[PDB]
Amino acid sequence: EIFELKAELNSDKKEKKKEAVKKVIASMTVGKDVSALFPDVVNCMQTDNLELKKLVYLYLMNYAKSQPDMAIMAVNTFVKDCEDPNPLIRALAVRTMGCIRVDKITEYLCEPLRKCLKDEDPYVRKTAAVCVAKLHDINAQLVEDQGFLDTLKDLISDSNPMVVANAVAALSEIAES
Amino acid sequence: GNIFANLFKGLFGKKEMRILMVGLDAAGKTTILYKLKLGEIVTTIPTIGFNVETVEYKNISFTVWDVGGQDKIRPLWRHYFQNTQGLIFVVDSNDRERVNEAREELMRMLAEDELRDAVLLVFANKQDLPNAMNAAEITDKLGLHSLRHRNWYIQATCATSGDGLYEGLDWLSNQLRNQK
Amino acid sequence: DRKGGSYSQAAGSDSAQS
Amino acid sequence: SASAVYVLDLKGKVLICRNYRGDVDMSEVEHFMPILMEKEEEGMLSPILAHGGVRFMWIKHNNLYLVATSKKNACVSLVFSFLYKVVQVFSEYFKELEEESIRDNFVIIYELLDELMDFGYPQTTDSKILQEYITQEAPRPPATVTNAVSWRSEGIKYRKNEVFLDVIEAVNLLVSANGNVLRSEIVGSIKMRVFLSGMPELRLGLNDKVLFDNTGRGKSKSVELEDVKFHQCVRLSRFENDRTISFIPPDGEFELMSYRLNTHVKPLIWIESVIEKHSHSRIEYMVKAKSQFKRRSTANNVEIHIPVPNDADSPKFKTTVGSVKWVPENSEIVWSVKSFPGGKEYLMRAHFGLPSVEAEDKEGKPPISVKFEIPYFTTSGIQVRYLKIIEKSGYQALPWVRYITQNGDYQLRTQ
Numbered sequence: 001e002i003f004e005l006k007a008e009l010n011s012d013k014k015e016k017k018k019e020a021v022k023k024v025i026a027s028m029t030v031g032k033d034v035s036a037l038f039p040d041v042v043n044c045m046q047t048d049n050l051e052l053k054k055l056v057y058l059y060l061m062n063y064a065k066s067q068p069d070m071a072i073m074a075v076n077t078f079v080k081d082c083e084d085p086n087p088l089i090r091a092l093a094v095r096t097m098g099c100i101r102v103d104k105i106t107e108y109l110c111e112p113l114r115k116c117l118k119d120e121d122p123y124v125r126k127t128a129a130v131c132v133a134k135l136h137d138i139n140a141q142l143v144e145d146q147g148f149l150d151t152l153k154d155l156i157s158d159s160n161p162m163v164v165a166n167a168v169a170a171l172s173e174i175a176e177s
Numbered sequence: 178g179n180i181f182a183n184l185f186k187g188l189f190g191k192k193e194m195r196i197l198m199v200g201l202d203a204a205g206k207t208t209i210l211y212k213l214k215l216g217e218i219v220t221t222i223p224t225i226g227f228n229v230e231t232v233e234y235k236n237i238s239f240t241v242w243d244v245g246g247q248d249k250i251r252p253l254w255r256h257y258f259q260n261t262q263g264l265i266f267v268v269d270s271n272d273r274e275r276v277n278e279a280r281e282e283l284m285r286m287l288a289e290d291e292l293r294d295a296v297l298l299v300f301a302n303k304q305d306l307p308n309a310m311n312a313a314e315i316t317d318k319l320g321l322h323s324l325r326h327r328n329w330y331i332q333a334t335c336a337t338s339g340d341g342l343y344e345g346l347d348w349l350s351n352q353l354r355n356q357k
Numbered sequence: 358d359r360k361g362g363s364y365s366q367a368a369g370s371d372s373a374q375s
Numbered sequence: 376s377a378s379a380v381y382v383l384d385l386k387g388k389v390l391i392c393r394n395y396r397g398d399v400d401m402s403e404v405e406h407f408m409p410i411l412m413e414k415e416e417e418g419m420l421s422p423i424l425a426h427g428g429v430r431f432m433w434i435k436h437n438n439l440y441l442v443a444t445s446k447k448n449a450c451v452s453l454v455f456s457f458l459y460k461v462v463q464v465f466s467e468y469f470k471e472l473e474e475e476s477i478r479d480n481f482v483i484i485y486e487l488l489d490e491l492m493d494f495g496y497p498q499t500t501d502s503k504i505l506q507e508y509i510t511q512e513a514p515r516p517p518a519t520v521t522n523a524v525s526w527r528s529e530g531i532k533y534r535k536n537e538v539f540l541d542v543i544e545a546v547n548l549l550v551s552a553n554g555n556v557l558r559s560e561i562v563g564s565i566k567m568r569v570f571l572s573g574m575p576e577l578r579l580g581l582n583d584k585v586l587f588d589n590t591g592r593g594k595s596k597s598v599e600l601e602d603v604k605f606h607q608c609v610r611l612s613r614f615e616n617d618r619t620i621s622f623i624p625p626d627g628e629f630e631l632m633s634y635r636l637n638t639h640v641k642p643l644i645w646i647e648s649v650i651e652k653h654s655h656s657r658i659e660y661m662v663k664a665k666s667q668f669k670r671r672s673t674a675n676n677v678e679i680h681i682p683v684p685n686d687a688d689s690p691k692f693k694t695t696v697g698s699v700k701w702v703p704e705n706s707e708i709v710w711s712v713k714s715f716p717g718g719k720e721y722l723m724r725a726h727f728g729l730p731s732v733e734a735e736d737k738e739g740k741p742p743i744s745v746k747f748e749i750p751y752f753t754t755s756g757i758q759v760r761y762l763k764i765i766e767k768s769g770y771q772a773l774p775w776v777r778y779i780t781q782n783g784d785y786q787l788r789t790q
């Protein structure tokens with residue numbers, strides 16, 4: 001079971017890795033403590049398949065608070081994924097960076113947040129605004145130091161009206177707290 | 178059982194091989210991996226985690242797993258040691274103060290029972306300035322000749338120039354692959 | 358045919374409104 | 376501002392959960408079931424639960440409770456709208472809303488939930504847009520979401536440009552036990568299934584009372600809807616300016632406009648019920664149905680539900696037109712009629728016995744409701760003038776529309 005899943009995840013077969021990820025996701029949804037296999041899935045994280053990347057990001061987000069120490073092996077992967085040409089991959093990386101409740105994880109994600117703040121894609125802009133709002137909620141001092149208030153304010157008077165609305169909502173949420 | 182399919186696959190090349198990317202920070206490990214995979218010296222951000230890439234040469238796909246030399250990433254090299262067949266160590270000949278740290282890290286990595294079948298792969302990184310040591314002084318300082326039961330080879334490679342990477346890859350292939 | 362009222366063609370605008 | 380939206384089950388098991396803010400622990404879902412059970416047993420159960428300082432708003436789904444736990448004073452209306460959008464997206468993607476599809480599309484369900492909202496703020500809500508980027512069987516996000524026109528995907532090509540409209544009319548009559556109608560409101564429904572090539576901008580035009588008065592033609596029969604709600608693609612600026620219903624039709628079936636105004640006309644079907652119930656001896660059902668609608672319109676599938684006694688047994692039906700069937704599960708007799716032409720008079724005489732032992736507690740007097748549905752009938756009299764279909768490329772459209780009249784809240788209070 002657990003040993004077989006770990007062996008499958010520690011293999012070089014894409015089908016076996018996908019099957020192991022699906023089994024881990026099903027166990028997690030069914031009520032199985034799969035946080036012990038998070039370090040094993042850390043190595044099998046940088047994958048070309050988008051389906052496996054989403055599952056890995058979801059496992060890391062759900063296994064970030066449980067194993068904050070094991071989450072230090074994903075900062076490089078997050079930084080690499082933040083520059084992905086695909087807008088969906090960049091948006092997913094931005095969402096996962098802000099969804100990880102790690103005190104030392106958001107500190108290293110300030111540079112990716114600043115890089116994605118000026119994203120031309122309206123979806124990328126909305127994801128960056130959401131990540132900035134999440135960082136401000138988790139750490140208001142970190143958000144103030146990063147100077148994301150000016151970027152959020154300027155997002156309102158830009159294009160991408162959905163992105164403008166997302167930035168306005170993020171600014172209101174920051175001001176609400 | 179029949180091994181006709183295996184023979185057919187091996188006739189045109191089936192062996193892949195493995196490799197590792199370990200060493201001190203700013204020792205050219207990432208640059209060496211980029212040169213092996215791409216062939217250019219590209220500046221990269223510090224390796225907080227690890228870099229995963231594959232290089233195909235001589236019909237063998239020698240995948241290289243970059244490992245940072247940071248303090249928070251130095252103890253994480255054991256995680257990448259699992260399911261790994263090769264290991265390449267990049268030495269910093271221009272960092273005399275960090276030379277002792279690199280030698281200690283290499284000794285600690287080679288002093289593990291799990292990492293026993295992997296031959297030593299010492300690359301003389303930063304081999305472009307006069308302060309860089311030769312292929313024997315660096316090995317003597319690191320004590321590569323005293324690594325019993327380990328096939329350690331000292332090679333000098335310059336990240337900017339890229340010379341010696343082909344020789345190191347050929348030596349690694351010869352050490353790993355023992356076929357015609 | 359279809360239950361609930363047969364489909365009927367619709368115009369483009371009020372021709373009597375100019 | 377719900378902390379995390381999760382889908383529960385009939386047994387309290389969470390089919391799927393997805394935290395959005397992380398300010399609420401995932402263990403609060405377990406206490407939601409006992410709280411709901413306590414509220415149901417005491418009559419204090421509400422859709423918006425409250426577990427200490429965290430409110431767990433839940434919506435009764437087809438098979439699971441969509442519990443959306445929240446911590447701060449988030450927008451309750453916004454949370455309800457997000458839950459409704461998620462339910463609509465799930466219904467569009469999965470034809471079944473139960474535990475069978477909850478655990479069968481988890482790989483795509485998690486991705487859809489992640490893409491829908493982030494940090495408690497929904498971002499994607501279009502079913503077509505969501506299906507164009509997340510599928511169960513991934514490319515970059517479509518430009519339609521980023522572009523202003525998020526309800527009409529560009530580049531759609533069809534062999535023929537045919538749009539099927541539906542003039543759905545709901546006749547709701549609230550007739551009290553005294554014989555007088557209290558709530559008599561008719562809600563219009565202008566739903567069109569546009570299937571053409573490109574992204575044409577529909578120019579809706581009907582015989583509106585306000586439009587007729589503005590144009591000076593306020594002398595013919597015009598529909599004056601008390602409440603008119605435009606669709607998402609419908610531009611509210613044109614409607615506020617000069618009542619111009621100009622918007623890009625969606626790709627598929629969508630609701631453009633939905634009229635809602637009170638009705639001051641006589642009911643389409645006049646149903647009078649007589650209860651000749653003896654004292655633990657027998658029961659009499661003197662149900663007479665009078666068709667107040669036009670004789671040219673026939674009420675197809677008319678089912679006048681007359682609630683029979685809860686403990687009544689051995690019933691006998693003596694009617695003239697329409698089959699009468701007593702369903703023990705429903706505890707009532709429905710005067711089902713296949714075709715009900717206007718002006719028809721159907722009289723029924725029910726007769727059934729009662730148990731000798733009287734009931735321990737009362738069962739109430741549920742109102743009698745009919746299921747009359749006469750298509751091709753326009754009770755409101757509103758007639759569509761024209762539909763301005765304009766495309767940049769230029770094509771000849773052949774839109775179609777059908778008027779359907781049915782019975783909505785047409786409940787008659789029992790005696």
Ligand SMILES: Nc1nc2c(ncn2[C@@H]2O[C@H](COP(=O)(O)OP(=O)(O)OP(=O)(O)O)[C@@H](O)[C@H]2O)c(=O)[nH]1
Nearest residue numbers: 202203204205206207208221223224303305336337
């Ligand atoms: N410019 C230059 N740099 C060299 C040369 N030889 C080795 N280097 C080192 O190679 C490093 C390249 O950085 P990285 O791509 O991050 O690779 P790395 O040395 O393993 O550093 P980390 O990934 O952080 O561990 C530079 O910082 C240099 O210190 C050389 O000949 N020229």
Ligand SMILES: [Mg+2]
Nearest residue numbers: 206207224243
């Ligand atoms: Mg590196």
